[PDB]
Amino acid sequence: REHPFIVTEPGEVARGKKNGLDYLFHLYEQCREFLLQVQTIAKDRGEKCPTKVTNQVFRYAKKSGASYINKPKMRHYVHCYALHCLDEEASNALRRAFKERGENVGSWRQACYKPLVNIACRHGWDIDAVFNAHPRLSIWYVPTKLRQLCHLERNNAVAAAAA
Amino acid sequence: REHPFIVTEPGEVARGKKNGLDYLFHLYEQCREFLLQVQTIAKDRGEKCPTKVTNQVFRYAKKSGASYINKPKMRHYVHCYALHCLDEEASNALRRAFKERGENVGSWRQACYKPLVNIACRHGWDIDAVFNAHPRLSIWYVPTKLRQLCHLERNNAVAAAAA
DNA sequence: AGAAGGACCAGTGGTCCGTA
DNA sequence: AGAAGGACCAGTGGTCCGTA
Numbered sequence: 510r511e512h513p514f515i516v517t518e519p520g521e522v523a524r525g526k527k528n529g530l531d532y533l534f535h536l537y538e539q540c541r542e543f544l545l546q547v548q549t550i551a552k553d554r555g556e557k558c559p560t561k562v563t564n565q566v567f568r569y570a571k572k573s574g575a576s577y578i579n580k581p582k583m584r585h586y587v588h589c590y591a592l593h594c595l596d597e598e599a600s601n602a603l604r605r606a607f608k609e610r611g612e613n614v615g616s617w618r619q620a621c622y623k624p625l626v627n628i629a630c631r632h633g634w635d636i637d638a639v640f641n642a643h644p645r646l647s648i649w650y651v652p653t654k655l656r657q658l659c660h661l662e663r664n665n666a667v668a669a670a671a672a
Numbered sequence: 673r674e675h676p677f678i679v680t681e682p683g684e685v686a687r688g689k690k691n692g693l694d695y696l697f698h699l700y701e702q703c704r705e706f707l708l709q710v711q712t713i714a715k716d717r718g719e720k721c722p723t724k725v726t727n728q729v730f731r732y733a734k735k736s737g738a739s740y741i742n743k744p745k746m747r748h749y750v751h752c753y754a755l756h757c758l759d760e761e762a763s764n765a766l767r768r769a770f771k772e773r774g775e776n777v778g779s780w781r782q783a784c785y786k787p788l789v790n791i792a793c794r795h796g797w798d799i800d801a802v803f804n805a806h807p808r809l810s811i812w813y814v815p816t817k818l819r820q821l822c823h824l825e826r827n828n829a830v831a832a833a834a835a
Numbered sequence: 836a837g838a839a840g841g842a843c844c845a846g847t848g849g850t851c852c853g854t855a
Numbered sequence: 856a857g858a859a860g861g862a863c864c865a866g867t868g869g870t871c872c873g874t875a
Contacts, residue, residue, distance in 0.1 A: 510855070513858050555823025557814070558800075564847055579860050581850065613857060637721075650848080651720070660718025673875070676838050727867055742840050744870065776837060813868080 511577050516608045516617045519601050530589075530604060536578060537590045537645075543570045543578075544648055561648050588655045589621045594646045595639065599624050625655060626662050634663035674740050679771045679780045682764050693752075693767060699741060700753045700808075706733045706741075707811055724811050751818045752784045757809045758802065762787050788818060789825050797826035 517529035544559065544566045551558040559565060562583070570578040593600040603624065607617040629636045636659045641647045680692035707722065707729045714721040722728060725746070733741040756763040766787065770780040792799045799822045804810045 510859060555819060555826070557819070580848090581860055581862095582858095584849070585859090615857065653849080656718060656720070663718070673839060743868090744840055744842095745838095747869070748839090778837065816869080 511582075514614045516604060516612060516614055518605050518608055533586060534590055534593050536583065537587075537649075539575060540566060540570065540578060540583060541645060541648060543573065543575070561650060584650075584652065586618065587649050588625055588652050589618055591640065591646055591649070591655075592621045592625055594643050595628055596624065622655060622658055626658050629659045630662065630666065634659055634666070674745075677777045679767060679775060679777055681768050681771055696749060697753055697756050699746065700750075700812075702738060703729060703733065703741060703746060704808060704811060706736065706738070724813060747813075747815065749781065750812050751788055751815050752781055754803065754809055754812070754818075755784045755788055757806050758791055759787065785818060785821055789821050792822045793825065793829065797822055797829070 512523075512526045512528050514530065514533055515523055515527045517523055517531065519531065521529055521531070523529035523532070540562055544562050547566050547569050548558050550556075564580070567578065567580045567583075592603070600621075603620060604617070607620060612620075625636075629639055632639050636651050636656060640649065640651055675686075675689045675691050677693065677696055678686055678690045680686055680694065682694065684692055684694070686692035686695070703725055707725050710729050710732050711721050713719075727743070730741065730743045730746075755766070763784075766783060767780070770783060775783075788799075792802055795802050799814050799819060803812065803814055
């Protein structure tokens, strides 16, 4: 079992039997590389080429010895990686704030939604288009909860701001 | 059970308990319309919006009383519809030739591959890009056999034409 | 034989909940 | 209690093969 994550500030190495948030974001980068490898082979074999991280990519990671990668964990933190990709400055500031407050990873994770919803609001509430416009982020399915919040907020927007 | 298809020429109404090929192509158009309707609702509900005909679309067709639509049949003839979309003139000519020869639908269907492979060859063998570049055709997954033939042919091309 | 489609199957997206 | 991930489940892509 991998060591649990804790909230770290940018560049910080986590002390003890813990992993930091930069390590977390690095896992997404490693997954992206595994997708590139799956795509290379699919195209060479004339097979349908995936454009997203899929079960196939996770199996490929495991086969390549990257056991510490697993689907539930990667899907769980995807919106956190999203914020890091889309507004690294805000991501860094949120990390510093939550570290200072001694918040745990679950709480920091929850706080990551709000700024993403705000980014969505600034793009006609099109969260899919937000993900797809960022090269690193475009390979990740939009998480259910994030999509629901963006929709809840757009409705409140059309409602409150129609009176 | 729907009446079986027979090879017809453009505009021809099939006589007796038979359906013609224009009727067949019309079924694809109807499916496209059902996808548009599924997309409208997905987007309004803030759900992930499909970009392809999926099980969801077929279920939607059935619910709307279009029982004569079913997945196996639509998937079976998709490359035939593809040829009609991509090179209607060649499609028409192949239909006329096979009608004249008294060929059955299975044989005409088989003959539809070749011209599609040729179209693929003219686009760097990228059959996915061929499908995606045509607005009507882009919503249909490339059929397995067509993909395999395009790959078999590209290899023969790089092989024969490297000596 | 030629052909339409119910129904199954392997593998997917999605995440719960038994575990440490 | 906070957190990592095995494993399951509903529904998908894909098409075989029992049917007419």
